[PDB]
From TrEMBL, chains A, B, C, D:
Every Enolase C-terminal TIM barrel domain range: 138-422
Family statement drawn from the similarity comment of this UniProt entry: Belongs to the enolase family.
Binding residues for substrate: 154, 163, 282, 309, 361-364, 385
The protein's name in its UniProt record: Enolase
Enzyme nomenclature, EC number: 4.2.1.11
Domain Enolase N-terminal: residue ranges: 4-133
Function of the molecule: Catalyzes the reversible conversion of 2-phosphoglycerate (2-PG) into phosphoenolpyruvate (PEP). It is essential for the degradation of carbohydrates via glycolysis.
Cofactor notes: Mg(2+) is required for catalysis and for stabilizing the dimer.
Biological or metabolic pathway of the protein: Carbohydrate degradation; glycolysis; pyruvate from D-glyceraldehyde 3-phosphate: step 4/5
Ligand binding ((2R)-2-phosphoglycerate): 162, 334, 363-364, 385
Keyword Cytoplasm appears in the UniProt entry: yes
Length: 423, 423, 423, 423
């Protein structure tokens, strides 16, 4: 019987050396599971609240209050529940907290317990996590959307686009797709050395060279793909996270490379589509620019995937508003933006039912936890955004997808160019 | 370890007294599961082939060849496989057969093994079948689309529409929705007695009274809903299976109540939408009328759900062609039209990803097997078509949904009017 | 019974996106364990040989030959052995290979199997890995020697010292020591931003700012410690990896910041000891400069720990030669330099018996594997070198030490300033 | 789970027929273990206190108070602890007692519980005791230091040296080394019969013939080695326990064979090194003669192992003082001198880290318990002092080393002449 017996939490460090929550759940059958919670560098206004300790300790970023909340309140509210009743457990966490944004117990305390319970349920059932969450039909390995060059608020350069990604869509399999991603990243390291540009890594393991702007960054990436013996677009296509909220002024406009309107940003993005093998653009406009996004999606949404991150925050409520308004055609899925597995899967359901694609995403503050790799296959997103093929908080996810591919055998299918029908 | 050890089959009878396949699978951990295969009265041209024995025995409808195929060939090909690898098992069945339409081993032999393996995997994992297929997020109880009055090729009347269904969309829960369906069906029995019309049941448990046509049948149903103390549309809405292939002549047109064109049938259906609280119409045109369907879906598809049954036959290939052509907005899901659980779930995936709704369906020849009730919740269709609340091959499904609702507790949600946003 | 039943290997990626070996071992009692192998960016001449595939794939760095060697040859030679007989298993791996430097099967294939077997033995015995390797007396949490600023061959600067580390020796506990390391690293990020220097990370997660030389780097670190509210030396002391082989010419001398002799390098190092709270210096001279090292150890060895890395390569044979010659007073312990757990522990034994201290070390190419954290406590080194508190291939080790500290309860002791009696 | 459930004690007799403590521990998984406590004939001033009953019974040497202390107080303080947490259990015993020298509960009550818990933990983990204490690297069989001729306070003769030992350093294996020890002991019996000297045994199973002094005793032993067909020094070397405290007067000097100073005793010992194949001398000076020992160790410590017994009493505190002062180069390890396994292993750690060798030792009052044989291999001392190859309280240890050698197979290594690099 997979009845919850014990729930504990501890403070560990994330991949930027800031504290985060790790939760362990033990079931009465001796099943033990452990889940760690990611954290964003900068966050959407609309995200679930992380409980942070304040004061001097770790710059105010301690999570001892979250840890105490798991031991004093969450444990006692969920011990005796069946870990298979993920929706009951998640509803009891949400009711316990009693707030819209999980500001009392913290989204970080609550997601910790939610993910650990799911992991314990899967172990008890003797099923791999992808198969317990997705059922026996879970088999699709995601195209890895790999951040290899950074800009925006995440850089000390004149590039305002936050992330430049490669997507090995033409690969026959996920094992070959990871290798393609790795070989282009290694060749970009060599191209950067040869141009005398910096090869220091950012948070996501990508390079942050000081370059002129968006097209200069895309040209270096294209050179890297060719240098790896691969064809841009057919083999390795491109994607962006503009994260346009970071360069947007409330009620004013987009300060980009020139102040521009939503419609001008769209002309820019349209220009990039004509010049480059772009399959996806994330957050091309800001998190509350509902009019701009609708007009942009109407303009270019037939030609490229448009991903809502900060505009949706993995929230069914804000995503429903977007589907209604014809805003974006894809949802970035961040479990810690919403706080429970159940609410994450309701958002994925709302998207998938509504014709929108999904992309599972890391946070800039990640851990050795690989659960999003299992999530990406469980929900059959066909797309994952979990960093450069460097820094093991990113690579551990890619290694877990290798293991999932191997375990599926001839049942595995790599999403490849079927993730992006518009390209 | 849920390794397949034994696979046996026997000939049993379906709900019309014709033979069908039942398969039992035993795993090395002592797990035992049993699955029975439904059969259609009349079938789509494009369905997986049922192996039938021919000769005198049971009118040519014996399934001893299918039973022998399970023992001589399928068992030996899948023993030693892990029952958790549903896609490997289904691929090995499809490769074993080696034909497009499963004409060598039979769709009936193959689906038997496929469904029994899935059931055995769920038992081994100690999970209810809905939760093993759908994962921990499976929680949505379907609106029951209950056939209470028949016509077409299934009748001796002037009604050409095959099925008239009630849909208790306004109910707060599936337990109340089943009761509403039952009380309207009982009141329709009383209305029919009072009009001197026949109360003999058809295959699906609905009545087949000799009435004038479509609007006469809808009026009697509306009287029944009011007689039960319920409001037509707000509480109990209406749906149809025209099954228009049954009154279509190849290259000619629709002989309906008058020969009509696809566009004329659409004017008729449009007329019914203005006069009646219709939420869904299945097969309004014939199985290969791709032009007619596109024009109909363009005309009324914003106003009502349009379900493809015979046009799609639960086939990813034919459904892809429909999505491309803007044909229908819903897929009728019939596991035995395609032959494996895996191919059924790929069709559901293709639909759900593509913005199309799904409705799990019985066949006119059903069994005491309740697996489609678990399927409807697993895939979160929000809709099931499994007969009148009479004849236990129909009622056993409704009873299994009660048990699933009870087991989910406060996690259960009834789809209600959210299954039909267009109404 | 912990009899080895199955041995498998797969190619995964390390923290620099290059391939490495991961090995899984299953025992007949159902115990399953997984071990990943690290890889050095540049290597000592004397290290165990890594089998690499060559050709185009992953730049020649594929490990498919190593993976095949684990499946074709190692598995068959160790299945049926008791996983508790670590020395028998390691001797059978060494005899199987039949070469001095493990050049036939590869140090990477062999260490994979060695570490996985040890992990499986610990799981079977139901003991944490630190307690199975070190016995019930294992309780000492290491001072973390955290690389926060890089130079040498690992940089594009004028600093020739490869690694600048902080050592929180004055902390009351490992949990406080990790926090001190994290807060100084965060304050160094702020000091670097304020001097307009690069905050891109190197392989070990440290910063690589373009600075003048050794004393400029030490001054920035000292500013960071003070900025964190900590006292240099008393709270946070300093350590170096000169890696002097990287700037040494065979038979010629040390090109450093000026060509210098071994004795001149020693005058430099002696100067740094008078000016800075240095507790340790690794590889102050080159890997085969036996005369230089003896004279340096005689000169300053009473005043500071002198660590042999490339001079010893975790080899009992080369370490014995050093003890005999009065060369160094500490051994850097790198399991993959020697290839088996058993030979690693014989080197630690030879050192500890001989009055030499040990420091467990990461490689620049690391994985999500945390086994060296368990090793550092098992052998009671009191010292570990496993990166900056950034990049989870480094932080996962620090998180595992937190978990080990918590599990020991009041039995835990933090090595603190007792790791460095000379300071 | 190896949780302590029951702790009982009984009074048994030691090898001299005096009472001692035996402790049994039962764990909740059904593991049962038994440990007996040795006792010294005469003791160091600084040893842990043995609780003795006083009065008439067994000459005042009853241990009923110790037995009662195990049942009334120790059991209740350690039941519910994990037997794997040896340091927590030992700390709880030390805190319970609350005294420096364990004078309240008794070192004999406390060591009984400590050793039984360790044995129970090893059984629960299904590991031999040497492997549970020493980890998988424990493999070194000790040179047996076998007392074959006695003098001092342990005799009625003019020999003031307490123990004359043979050390079969040249043997290829422990099985051959035991045989060499046995054959020399049998030949010494024959040499003694032929000189008309007594063949009655002392407490340690050695002979106590009435001889002239030290050189007369060494000559008889040398004759015995030759008579066995072995070469003195190359095959069988010699060692001494002077136990010089027994012939030392507080503040006065050494009454030996002549009153002598520390420096004169050293001239004597130096003379014996020139004339005889001596590898080790234990307690050459008295337990508090810190100046004498330093000067002696400076004089001859390069030429022979100098073992501290009564000067260290297996106490980390007194051993630290010796390492600081350059006093001795080896620690005699007597678990009952300190009272817990944990404090014994901290003393071994302090020694081994500090370049000092260890020799595990029996007490003159021994039992059928063989645990020190497992300890000697666990800590890889390479040396054990556990009597003549006569009297089964001595031989049971040698028999247990045979069993440990056999169980290690080709992983076993005999320390041989590598235990004594100075010879
Ligand atoms: Cl919820
Ligand atoms: Cl869309
Ligand atoms: Cl998707
Ligand atoms: Cl298939
Ligand atoms: Cl649609
Ligand atoms: Cl649906
Ligand atoms: Cl070896
Ligand atoms: Cl030294
Ligand atoms: Cl050390
Ligand atoms: Cl202690
Ligand atoms: Cl020494
Ligand atoms: Cl030793
Ligand atoms: Mg974003
Ligand atoms: Mg139909
Ligand atoms: Mg180094
Ligand atoms: Mg003694």
């Amino acid at each position: 019987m997979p009845i919850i017996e014990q729930v504990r939490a501890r403070e560990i460090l994330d991949s930027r050396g800031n504290p985060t929550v790790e939760v362990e759940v033990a079931l009465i059958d001796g099943t033990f599971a452990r889940a760690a919670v990611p954290s964003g560098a900068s966050t959407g206004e609309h995200e679930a609240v992380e409980l942070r300790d304040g004061g001097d300790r770790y710059g105010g970023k301690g999570v001892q209050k979250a840890v105490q909340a798991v031991l004093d309140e969450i444990g006692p509210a969920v011990i005796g529940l069946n870990a298979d009743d993920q929706r009951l457990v998640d509803q009891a966490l949400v009711d316990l907290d009693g707030t819209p944004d999980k500001s009392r117990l913290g989204g970080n305390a609550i997601l910790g317990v939610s993910l650990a319970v799911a992991k314990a349920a899967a172990d008890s059932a003797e099923l791999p996590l992808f198969r317990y969450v997705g059922g026996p039909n879970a088999h699709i390995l995601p195209v890895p959307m790999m951040n290899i060059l950074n800009g925006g608020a995440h850089a000390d350069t004149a590039v305002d686009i936050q992330a430049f990604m490669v997507a090995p869509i033409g690969a026959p399999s996920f094992v070959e797709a990871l290798r393609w991603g790795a070989e282009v990243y290694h060749a970009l390291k060599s191209v950067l050395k040869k141009e005398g540009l910096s090869t220091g890594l950012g948070d996501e393991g990508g390079f942050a060279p000081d370059v002129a702007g968006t097209t200069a960054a895309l040209d270096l990436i294209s050179r890297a793909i060719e240098s790896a013996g691969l064809r841009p677009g057919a083999d390795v296509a491109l994607a962006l996270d503009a994260a346009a909220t970071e360069f947007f002024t409330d009620g004013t406009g987009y300060v980009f490379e020139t102040t521009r309107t939503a419609d001008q940003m769209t002309e820019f993005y349209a220009g990039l589509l004509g010049a480059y093998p772009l399959v996806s653009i994330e957050d091309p406009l800001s998190e509350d620019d509902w009019d701009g996004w609708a007009a942009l999606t109407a303009s270019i949404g037939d030609r490229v995937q448009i991903v809502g991150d900060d505009i949706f925050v993995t929230n069914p409520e804000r995503l429903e508003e977007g589907i209604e308004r014809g805003v974006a055609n894809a949802l970035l899925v961040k479990v810690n933006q919403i706080g429970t597995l159940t609410e994450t899967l309701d958002a994925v359901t709302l998207a998938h039912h509504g014709g929108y694609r999904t992309m599972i995403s890391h946070r800039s503050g990640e851990t050795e936890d690989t659960m999003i790799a299992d999530l990406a296959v469980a929900i059959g997103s066909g797309q994952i955004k979990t960093g450069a093929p460097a820094r093991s908080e990113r690579v551990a996810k890619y290694n877990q997808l290798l293991r999932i591919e191997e375990a599926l055998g001839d049942a595995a299918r790599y999403a490849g160019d079927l993730a992006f029908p518009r390209f």
